[PDB]
Design a protein around this ligand. Structure first.
Ligand SMILES: *[C@@H]1O[C@H](CO)[C@@H](O[C@@H]2O[C@H](CO)[C@@H](O[C@@H]3O[C@H](CO[C@H]4O[C@H](CO)[C@@H](O)[C@H](O)[C@@H]4O)[C@@H](O)[C@H](O)[C@@H]3O)[C@H](O)[C@H]2NC(C)=O)[C@H](O)[C@H]1NC(C)=O
Ligand SMILES: *[C@@H]1O[C@H](CO)[C@@H](O[C@@H]2O[C@H](CO)[C@@H](O)[C@H](O)[C@H]2NC(C)=O)[C@H](O)[C@H]1NC(C)=O
Ligand code: NAG
Lengths: 77, 49, 146, 49
């Protein structure tokens, strides 16, 4: 239940598929010992202690779903 | 990045995967990423070129 | 930490179906409570000196919800989870026109294939509207601040 | 939501509970570190699949 105006006429610009170009390998597995991508406790922090916490977490060393964005075609300006 | 989340999966007009029925959550950055707009709203396709 | 509260149209007739262990259609395909969180149920009625609320056309609930696979021989039962919604809600309208209404839709193979069907029942509008409130609390999900 | 433009790596996380969709980030608290911290509680009505 809101508002919002349409921008322009219903004529979308052309879209290509060139996923072969986007195929590349930049492996960055997450190192839990390096403290990457860990969900903090939601409302009860701690200090200077080692504690076991049960929750939602990722596996160590996952290649994941790496994606890359690219610019469109252009000739001059 | 831009995120699209939902609970229904279907095909487009040409049969390609990607259509999400009913209310859909969309995360989208704007203003060169300064703004982080989010909305769980109804989306409708366009029938143009 | 947080207070979550759902309101719905709930007349007195299926009040005995409000129990957690009850196997009625309300606990089957409509709504299920949280087993691990404290709960409260309130059944109330519209006061006569209160015109700020309206009433629905009729009460309606779902008595059947299951998934038909593409093999046309196997039917998967569905179970409502804690504060969750069945897929049959996506095909059942909010107001059911009459008792025995049957709703069907096509399921994509990425979502298991086959078809999703449901059946509902209607209860006539009495003299005064009765509704239900479900109160559930959370003690440590956020800052304790309500 | 506002995020100042910079060139510092950051983190983001998304999950769902019966309360709603919780969005966690490090831009609000740990700019030079990086950890999840609660900034958004989207009041979703349906489970995201
Ligand atoms: C880019 O962002 C601009 C600022 O955020 C947009 O201007 C806003 O556009 C949105 C829709 O895209 C609308 O904001 C909505 O506000 C309504 C309720 O506000 C309405 O009523 C007040 C007076 O009661 C009126 O002043 C407003 O203009 C609205 O008509 C909410 O229900 C929505 O959720 C949403 O927040 C407004 O149209 C407008 N608001 C302001 C403050 O300028 C701009 O339109 C965006 N770009 C495009 C192309 O839409
Ligand atoms: C945090 O805990 C560590 C671990 O015990 C404390 O560091 C120890 O302090 C004693 C005191 O002389 C040393 O003998 C140990 O070698 C220290 N161990 C380590 C690993 O540093 C530290 O004092 C505690 N800090 C606070 C603020 O409580
Ligand atoms: C979801 O979308 C499908 C197809 O557009 C429609 O049949 C169904 O009724 C919708 N459900 C809701 C709850 O909007």
């Amino acid at each position: 239940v809101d508002v919002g105006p349409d921008s322009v006429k219903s004529a979308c610009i052309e879209v290509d598929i060139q996923q072969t170009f986007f195929d590349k390998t930049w492996p960055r597995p997450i190192d839990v010992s390096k403290a990457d991508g860990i969900i903090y406790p939601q409302g009860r922090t701690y200090s200077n202690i080692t504690i076991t916490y049960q929750g939602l977490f990722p596996y160590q060393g996952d290649h994941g779903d790496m994606y890359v964005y690219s610019a469109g075609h252009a000739t001059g300006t | 990045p831009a995120f699209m989340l939902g609970s229904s999966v279907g095909n487009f007009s040409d049969g390609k995967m990607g259509r999400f029925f009913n209310h859909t959550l969309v995360l989208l950055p704007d203003g060169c990423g300064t703004l982080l707009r989010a909305f769980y709203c109804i989306l409708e396709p366009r029938s143009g070129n | 930490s947080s207070l979550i509260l759902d309101y719905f149209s709930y007349p007195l007739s299926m009040k005995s179906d409000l129990s957690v262990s009850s196997a009625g259609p309300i606990s089957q395909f409509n709504y299920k409570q949280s087993f691990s969180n404290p709960t409260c149920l309130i059944l109330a009625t519209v006061p006569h000196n209160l015109t700020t609320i309206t009433k629905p056309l009729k009460y309606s609930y779902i008595n059947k919800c299951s998934r038909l696979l593409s093999d046309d021989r196997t039917e998967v039962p569905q179970l409502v989870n804690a504060n969750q919604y069945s897929p049959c809600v996506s095909i059942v309208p909010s107001t059911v026109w009459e008792d025995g209404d049957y709703y069907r839709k096509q399921l994509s193979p990425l979502e298991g294939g086959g078809w999703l069907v449901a059946s509902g029942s209607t209860v006539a509008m009495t003299e005064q509207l009765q509704m239900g409130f479900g109160i559930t609390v959370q003690y440590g999900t956020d800052t304790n601040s309500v | 939501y506002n995020i100042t433009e910079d060139e510092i790596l950051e983190w983001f996380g998304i999950t769902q509970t019966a309360q709603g969709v919780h969005l966690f980030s490090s831009r609000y608290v740990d700019l030079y570190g990086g950890n999840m911290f609660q900034f958004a509680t989207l009041p979703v009505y349906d489970t995201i699949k």
